[model samples]
Target: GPHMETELIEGEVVEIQIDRSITGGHKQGKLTIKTTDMETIYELGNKMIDGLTKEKVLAGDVISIDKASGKITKLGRSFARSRDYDAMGADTRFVQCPEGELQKRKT
Candidate 1:
């Protein structure tokens, strides 16, 4: 369980979760990016490649997401608010929770 200000968004990535090709040589590892919108997706991809290190995400890696003021930072990285779902070229006007959000429940 998360705090009141927490926003959890989980999903099984159908596409390539992590891509280390940007670093060249062997791939970094299995890593996937997350966001509350599509714009974050696009910006995350670009910014992640440049800022963060060891960009790898696995398929079954359960993630707890949230948002408030400035850009959110994870894996020791920073981003900006300029990147929203609309910026990522997504028809994101609603809250799209992951398919397995329920299975992560606690009894």
Candidate 2:
């Protein structure tokens, strides 16, 4: 592929997982843009993580981006959530175990 600029690649937000990097609990968003053209996933990590959440970009927004540089040129407008669900987070509780537990029993 010789770096063609025409017929640019773009996609809509299929999923967004919000997670913090454990570095002083700063917020970060994991965005998965759904593209169906060329065989690739143009990963845009730190480029759009924090600013996106500030605009409250959800899991169903559209965006146009640069293929090579992972830069977003446009972001579509979407309805702001009024009040919604956290049932998954509220119910899916988790835990941690000690190292000794790893040697408990054999199958």
Candidate 3:
């Protein structure tokens, strides 16, 4: 089947699932992805293959959609930070560190 690039609003991914076809292969299946604010988008095996490899997109992956086309134009990873800590000391603080100074100290 011929694939078309469709537009999608910027939204958090809620779910992702892949369904394999009777004849299993890298380009064989339907890729179902759901976003937080919209219904699921179904990409057929051929379209999926053309857009990206099976390993590229994942359940937790963040994607950038084209503003005009609404198609996924780029891929990005999601990350979260627990907390920040001062390695020097609880009371001690660092205003700034120079790259050259750090290199000189290491040498």
Which model scores highest in TM-score? Answer: 2
Displacement of residue 23 (Cα, Å) in model 3 is 4.6
Candidate 2: tens digits of C-alpha lDDT, residues 1-107? 34665445556667766666545345445556777653234443555554454445666776655545644533444334433444557755443334244456842
Error of 3 at 12 (Å): 4.1
Model 1 C-alpha lDDT per residue in residues 1-107, reported as the tens digit of each score: 55454543333332333464555543332334444453223223443332233223333332323333212223222322323554434655554545345466742
RMSD of 2: 18.6
Ranking by TM-score: 2, 3, 1
Provide the overall lDDT of each model, using Cα atoms, as 2-decimal numbers. 0.36, 0.53, 0.46
Candidate 3, poorest ten consecutive residues by summed lDDT: 74-83
Q: In model 1, which regions exceed 4 Å deviation?
A: 17-55, 69-107
Q: Give Cα distance to truth, residue 83, candidate 2, Å.
A: 20
Model 3 Cα RMSD, Å?
A: 11.2
Candidate with the larger TM-score of 1 and 3: 3
In candidate 2, which residue ranges exceed 4 Å CA deviation? 1-9, 24-29, 36-44, 67-107
Candidate 3, residue 59: Cα displacement in angstroms equals 0.5
Off by over 4 Å in 3: 1-12, 19-28, 34-36, 64-72, 75-107
**Comparing 2 and 3 on lDDT, the stronger one:** 2
